[PDB]
Write a protein that binds this DNA or RNA. Structure first.
Length: 133
DNA sequence: AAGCATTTTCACGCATGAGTGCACAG
DNA sequence: TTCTGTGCACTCATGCGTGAAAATGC
């Protein structure tokens, strides 16, 4: 990414959150009685942004930005993960492909959402450390 | 009887960044 | 041969701030 200047002379990084320092400032200024437009002017942050941050702060008490990107589980869904754990639990010596075949035959997954063996072992590894935590 | 200021909204164009499944290796 | 661990490149459905138009407010 790269920094830029907005119509107010403020530096912003397109697609990224405003620095925590600015976010704290925003709430700090509001707390002392500054209206959103004042905060916008002083901190050279867009009015819409000031509004969103302040709004979310009042609703959640958080100044931290939410998680951008990533993705949601496609094959390793919670029920599938429970099942995988379920299979390993009752037969530790079981192979990933054996676990795959099971998820399929039992109908926990369709040929469209069946995890790759790799993912299955990844799931298994994720569970392993999880219980070490 | 007349407008500018504020605040509210959200389309935009951006940058991801979790989850997945390969090739490769032990 | 099999299997499972590593490292990678890919994917898109997210959330970002901005800018500006639509509401309000004053």
């Amino acid at each position: 990414s790269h920094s830029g200047v907005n119509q107010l002379g403020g530096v912003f990084v397109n697609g990224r959150p405003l620095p925590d320092s600015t976010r704290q400032r925003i709430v700090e200024l509001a707390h002392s009685g500054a209206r959103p437009c004042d905060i916008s002017r002083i901190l050279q942050v867009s009015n819409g942004c000031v509004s969103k941050i302040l709004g979310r702060y009042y609703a959640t008490g958080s100044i931290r930005p939410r998680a951008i990107g990533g993705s949601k589980p496609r094959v390793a869904t919670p029920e599938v993960v429970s099942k995988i754990a379920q299979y390993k639990q009752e037969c530790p010596s079981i192979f990933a492909w054996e676990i795959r075949d099971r998820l399929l035959s039992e109908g926990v997954c369709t040929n469209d959402n069946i995890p790759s063996v790799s993912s299955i072992n990844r799931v298994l590894r994720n569970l392993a450390s999880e219980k070490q935590q």
